[PDB]
């Protein structure tokens, strides 16, 4: 963990590394940032005061008688975290253009497509016939092998 949320959000901006902040839980390991990496990232002069005052509070805690060590270089910090992100990750309006997939008999009037595969359903013959009676319907079929991967591919792509 790191001594402040400010550094965590700063490295979130720099790469996106989700790093937690110490909240007096356990005698854990703490990272700290000196003048070199502060000048590297460009943190405001306000945050240096907070980090140094936390460091001297830990100094007081040590004198009252917990591990703290510092990172010096960007490459060392990259090896320290052990992960580099994949930059942008946009999120769409919804997961799929299909909102509902069901089996009920009363919904065949409103249904618009159907996939078929050998299944143990007592009403599969009935629902398949009823869906096939429509004048313009979107019917897909299985060709053996793995049905789950095909259906998952179809439901992502449709």
């Amino acid at each position: 963990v790191v001594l402040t949320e400010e550094i965590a959000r700063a490295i979130e901006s720099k790469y996106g590394t989700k790093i937690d902040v110490y909240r007096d839980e356990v005698p854990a390991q703490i990272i700290e940032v000196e003048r070199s990496l502060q000048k590297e990232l460009g943190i405001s002069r306000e945050g240096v005061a907070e980090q140094t005052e936390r460091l001297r509070d830990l100094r007081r805690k040590e004198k009252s008688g917990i591990t703290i060590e510092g990172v010096m270089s960007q490459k060392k910090l990259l090896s320290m975290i052990g992960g580099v992100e994949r930059k942008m990750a946009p999120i769409g309006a919804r997961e799929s253009a299909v909102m509902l997939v069901s089996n009920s008999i009363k919904d065949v009037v409103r249904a618009t497509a159907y996939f078929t595969a050998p299944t143990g359903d007592p009403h599969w013959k009935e629902v398949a016939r009823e869906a096939s009676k429509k004048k313009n319907i979107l019917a897909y079929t299985s060709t053996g092998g793995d049905v789950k991967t095909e259906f998952l591919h179809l439901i992502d792509h449709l």
Binding site: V101, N103, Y114
Partner: peptide
Amino acid sequence: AMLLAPGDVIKRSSEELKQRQIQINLIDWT
């Protein structure tokens, strides 16, 4: 648009359906 799928494959892939936030109506045939 909507789709009709067999109950067994819905029961097997219902985790993906709830992970993708899709709506389902199902009748368990015992």
